[PDB]
Amino acid sequence: DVPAAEDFPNAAIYNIDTSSESPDHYLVDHTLDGRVLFPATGYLSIVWKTLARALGLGVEQ
Amino acid sequence: DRRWKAGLYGLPRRSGKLKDLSRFDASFFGVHPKQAHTMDPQLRLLLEVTYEAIVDGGINPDSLRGT
């Protein structure tokens, strides 16, 4: 890895990866109609983490 | 919390910090006001500290000029 031009200065964005090594691998279990879907509560966790970062606290806090 | 809010990112709450960083006698050192704001606080303090160090030895800094 080498830095790019966008790493330097000039909102929150989350990447949902369902691959095995990815921490979000469990999402592949939530399948409805045979097509995987992001859980309705999945957005809630993302927004909760974003607000927690905005305030400066952890989610459990 | 002079520098940043204490406990940020889980950092230790205690650390040694100078009393004030926003002071500088620019007119003495021939620095225009615009450049004084954009100057590093380390350099702003170090100019004064160096002048104090030179005189602290009883040596007028003019004697060292040109050496």
Q: Resolution to 1 decimal, in Å?
A: 3.3
A30 is catalytic: yes
Task: Say how far apart CA A1 and CA B8 lie, in whole Å.
Answer: 29
The structure was resolved experimentally with cryo-EM
Helix (H, G, I), strand (E, B) or coil at B5: coil
H/E stretch holding A45 reads helix A40-55
- Written as six digits, the tokens of B27 are 């007119």
Task: Say how far apart CA B28 and CA B61 lie, in whole Å.
Answer: 14
| Residue whose structure tokens are 């500290």 | B49
Task: Say how far apart CA A37 and CA A43 lie, in whole Å.
Answer: 12
Is residue A15 within 8 A of residue A54, CB to CB? The reply is no
Task: Say how far apart CA A45 and CA A53 lie, in whole Å.
Answer: 12
Helix (H, G, I), strand (E, B) or coil at B42: helix
H/E stretch holding A36 reads strand A35-36
A39-57 in b/e form (b: 16+ CB < 10 A) is: eeeeeeeeeeeeeeeeeee
For residue A8, give Cα distances in angstroms to A3, A4, A5.
9, 8, 6
Query: Annotated catalytic residue: which of A14, A25, A30, A59?
Result: A30
H helix runs in chain B, sequence order:
33-37, 41-56, 61-64
